[PDB]
Design a protein around this nucleic acid. Sequence first.
DNA 1: GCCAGAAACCCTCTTTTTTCGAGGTCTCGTAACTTGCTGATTTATAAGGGTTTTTTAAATCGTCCGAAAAAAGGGTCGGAAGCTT
DNA 2: GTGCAAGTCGTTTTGCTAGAGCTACATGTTCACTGC
DNA 3: GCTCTAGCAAAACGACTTGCACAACGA
Lengths: 310, 317, 54, 54
Amino acid sequence: ILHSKRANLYYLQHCRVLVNGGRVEYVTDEGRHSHYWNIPIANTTSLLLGTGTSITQAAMRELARAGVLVGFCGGGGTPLFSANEVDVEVSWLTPQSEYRPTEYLQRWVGFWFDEEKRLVAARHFQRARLERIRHSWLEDRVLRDAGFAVDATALAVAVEDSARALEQAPNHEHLLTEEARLSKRLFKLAAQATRYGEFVRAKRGSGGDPANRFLDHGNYLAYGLAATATWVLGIPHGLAVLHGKTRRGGLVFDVADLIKDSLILPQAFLSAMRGDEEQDFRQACLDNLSRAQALDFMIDTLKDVAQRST
Amino acid sequence: SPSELKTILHSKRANLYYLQHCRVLVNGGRVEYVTDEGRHSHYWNIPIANTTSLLLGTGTSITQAAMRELARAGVLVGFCGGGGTPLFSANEVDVEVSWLTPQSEYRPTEYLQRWVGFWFDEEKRLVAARHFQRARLERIRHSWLEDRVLRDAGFAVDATALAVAVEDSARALEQAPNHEHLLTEEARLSKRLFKLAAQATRYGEFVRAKRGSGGDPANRFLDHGNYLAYGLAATATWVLGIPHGLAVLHGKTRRGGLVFDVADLIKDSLILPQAFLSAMRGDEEQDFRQACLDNLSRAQALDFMIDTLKDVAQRST
Amino acid sequence: RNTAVACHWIRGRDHSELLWIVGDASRFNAQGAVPTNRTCRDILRKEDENDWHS
Amino acid sequence: RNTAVACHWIRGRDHSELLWIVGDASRFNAQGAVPTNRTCRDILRKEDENDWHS
DNA sequence: GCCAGAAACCCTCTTTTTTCGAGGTCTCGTAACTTGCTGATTTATAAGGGTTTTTTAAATCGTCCGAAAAAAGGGTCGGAAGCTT
DNA sequence: GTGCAAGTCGTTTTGCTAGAGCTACATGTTCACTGC
DNA sequence: GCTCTAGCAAAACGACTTGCACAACGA
């Protein structure tokens, strides 16, 4: 249930959170034996209330006493609906509320306005993304066994070439387009491996074939996971690195990018070819995300870029 | 759908709920809150579309599905103490309200960029604070001296004394060299307003209580009204995407300070007259809240709040 | 005892008020709203938790 | 076909009007009122008198 | 290019139209009846007083229902008390 | 003949009880044109 | 645990049927 070992983030489902006798208690079908009792309550913990759960104001009081962030997310924890805002660590605020302020916003803003540094960040994002493609498509054979048998030499050549291109070109405007070309080739490779036939990527949900729908669902979950990552870091969604400065919710899409083609896309084609239900697809996606430590990776990346930007 | 629901402009939704002793759940696709009534449990409707925020008090609980709906509609949820007390407070710590902001409804990206552009230089912040206060003074004058409703309700005030107090404070604001002096001026301004309000309302001598501990009706109403102001401020700052943390004035004794800084715009221009007015009438907390929300709706408090935030970000370029 | 009537006044543009209720006031809340559904089932379950904060 | 929703706009002061109806318009009259009782008994015995004035 | 109208597609309700099913009812076919043969063996039976099992009523108990009584609540009228003039 | 009131009786509306699942469907940018 | 769906039963509701009274109490 520990959703991110890097963030001390826990997912609670099928239980009520209430305060009896001055201690926050979980009313669950397992009673005393539920693992929720092992939840450490400290300023380092952060909760994610899941499906079928409710919380009492008294609990909110006790958690605030202990300084524990709370957030509501849907099935499996991908769509993050609402959460507590996290503080910002600077010398002029200084409340004693015992809430672990986080300093990453200052680091982010310290460079966000300098375009050259912003570009350097974009490059760093894409380096990470490609290396996660090469990892999941080649190094690990779980997909191979599942049925996603694809050629390697063509994929390796394409990825090598795109990586070679990343280290070049002057502005965001090229990077976006280079990624788009890589995207197209990856789609073609996946369709060939899946024997799905010809594939064309419609957008704004105009597609009707299973592949398109499953891609949309997968991307929706990925966005939710990224939103969780940013919220844990406290960075507002508007300070995008690679998407346009006017794009509402740009940053989450920047962060979501580092898994779409690594983990969502193959599963979308696999499930479409296998003829799965939408529910089966959702469960498979969440299982893949859990297996890959996705949230932890996207946390590590954001921290790495912050430290590297100095 | 997430769209076709956030169509009522947030600055024009006409409700703001305060709930106690109930469970906020979902029933038949609608978001409802249930209250024990002895005979039965009664389900009560909540129009999420026409709602700015929920404030949940003592003995209150909420379920996840309701959060999903409220987040979709862009409604804030806040857990607070019972009817005018902090949710948490111990030693010299206070946590007035714990806010659950929506995170799945992406918000504009410009006001945030301006705000964070200037928020990291104390002088620029100080200029913002000055603008906040000048707006507050302006609102005070317009509301107390140019509103027929408050006058007719019986809020006859000494124009000359108020005018000189406003001018004196405004000059001091201009003289303010740094934050501490600014806060002292805030304190002096505040109580002189209390003094004027009281004896203009036949209340007689009055004193402001500390940390929500007041006994007399006036202090209790003021403490309760503050939360209504907090709620409107929280939604005002959210709808522009500005995080609560980035305060300018009250930040260094409060979590999510910017809410309080914004709330001061409306704390005194409204609320303060209504509190004493209700006390005169011998009203009951239920009534005071009802009348206060009516005034806040008539004066378009949220719109003024939103405009001011836009302007001060705007003005910092 | 079954009688229950509520009277609302529109004192102007974009504001309305409650004047009086005749009969069983329990059929309305303070603002004059009416419950959507009611059940004798114990949905609130206030029994579960207690106020012994120490 | 069972939907019948009428929307009235209070123009303030002494006046109000009907904006639109969704669904079966026959459940309301032009001014948006609703019939209070319905019957298939042969009230209004048109059959009795005729128009042959001459 | 703009505007309007008409037409094709989606969903559900309302109403006949058709269909179905139960069941009710009648009539004739026919496998198993009835009637007729003998003689050795088994079974039933005429009366009535003393004796087992079931029926039947009465009493009891329990439950249910309805009605009546009591409680509760909505409201009006008149009078007294308190406050203000 | 018109309308009231007491009694009937077909819908129609609400709540109760089991039982079963566990959603929420794009997101490349900048800027010129369009409403109040 | 929370909510939705399907099936049921009780109650509320409105129209119909019948028998009959035929009203409205300052100057």
